[PDB]
Design a protein around this nucleic acid. Structure first.
Ligand SMILES: [Cs+]
Ligand SMILES: [Cs+]
Length: 327
DNA sequence: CATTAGA
DNA sequence: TCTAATG
């Protein structure tokens, strides 16, 4: 957590680079298990050789630990950190729509900067266009003050259209968070579950609603169960307009909400931990259900969930307010 | 780890 | 179809 710091940090810096700037899935994958294992290790690595006794720790990596341990740096790291091409990719990658694959290409073409991208809006697809458009806004954090604002409108129309709907804004927002990166609405309806062969409309309906009023302003992607877009709070009586905000809505069979909701609510750890516990408690938790474990090794048979509660009661725990689902 | 765009 | 990108 801190004794092994520099190492894991450098190591991850190393991994991340193979993956993006190069296409070295493997070397990349390498650096990471290593960085993984060196991280669990309970003592201060004092030398390569020492680390070297680790799994995943080979000669290549080890050699690296030395240099780092020896001098407070690493050339390869100082070399890459410098490298304009590699920088470029690092950068282009921020644009929403742009991944590594695209970034390399863009680069290869000569598009390295923000403006470069403008000059060639043509080479970009819709997503990347939008992302390009809202580069600033996209990067900006969402104040809870605002999330509340948004959550308000969202449950409003949801209700308007159909009153049989159920929305929940999941995420760190759900969990108290002073701010968030984007909004996440989990959606369901009774008329939709496991078998009941869809009703795409159910998603459609709402999307349209939220648009009709000017809340949604772009569409990054719209499927039959997972809308992914951009939104904006009605810029008031002027002098202050609201930044463009990423929003995502998703349809879910009423019969898998709560686990879904639980799950997306986090945190990553609260989850893992609650999850780990259900195991002992003779259960299995995953984003969609909760199955009782059978001794043979495994088992199935989803247990009926009507609320966050059921899942809890199940593994016989303390209902944890989302506020304190921190871990 | 599954859904959506796209070409 | 496969392959990229989000989450
Ligand atoms: Cs080893
Ligand atoms: Cs990106």
């Amino acid at each position: 957590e801190t004794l092994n710091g520099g190492i894991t940090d450098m190591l991850t810096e190393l991994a991340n680079f193979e993956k993006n700037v190069s296409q070295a899935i493997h070397k990349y994958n390498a650096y990471r298990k290593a960085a993984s294992v060196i991280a669990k290790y309970p003592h201060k690595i004092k030398s390569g050789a020492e680390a070297k006794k680790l799994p995943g720790v080979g000669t290549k990596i080890a050699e690296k630990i030395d240099e780092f341990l020896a001098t407070g740096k690493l050339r390869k790291l100082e070399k890459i950190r410098q490298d304009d091409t590699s920088s470029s990719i690092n950068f282009l990658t921020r644009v929403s729509g742009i991944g590594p694959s695209a970034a390399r290409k863009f680069v290869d073409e000569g598009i390295k900067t923000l403006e470069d991208l403008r000059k060639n809006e043509d080479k970009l697809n819709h997503h990347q266009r939008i992302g390009l458009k809202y580069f600033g806004d996209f990067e900006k954090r969402i104040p809870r003050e605002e999330m509340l604002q948004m959550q308000d409108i969202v449950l409003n129309e949801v209700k308007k259209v159909d009153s049989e709907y159920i929305a929940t804004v999941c995420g760190s927002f759900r969990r108290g968070a002073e701010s968030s990166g984007d909004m996440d609405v989990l959606l369901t309806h009774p008329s939709f579950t496991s078998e009941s062969t869809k009703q795409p409309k159910l998603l459609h309906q709402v999307v349209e609603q939220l648009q009709k009023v000017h809340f949604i302003t772009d569409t990054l992607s719209k499927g039959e169960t997972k809308f992914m877009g951009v939104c904006q709070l009605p810029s008031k009586n002027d002098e202050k307009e609201y930044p463009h905000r990423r929003i995502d809505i998703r349809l879910i069979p009423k019969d898998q909400y709560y686990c879904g909701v639980l799950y997306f609510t986090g945190s990553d750890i609260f989850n893992k931990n609650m999850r780990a516990h259900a195991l002992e408690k003779g259960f299995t938790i995953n984003e969609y259900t909760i199955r009782p474990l059978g001794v043979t090794g495994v088992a199935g048979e989803p247990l009926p969930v009507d609320s966050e509660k059921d899942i809890f009661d199940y593994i016989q725990w303390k209902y944890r307010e989302p506020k304190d689902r921190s871990e």
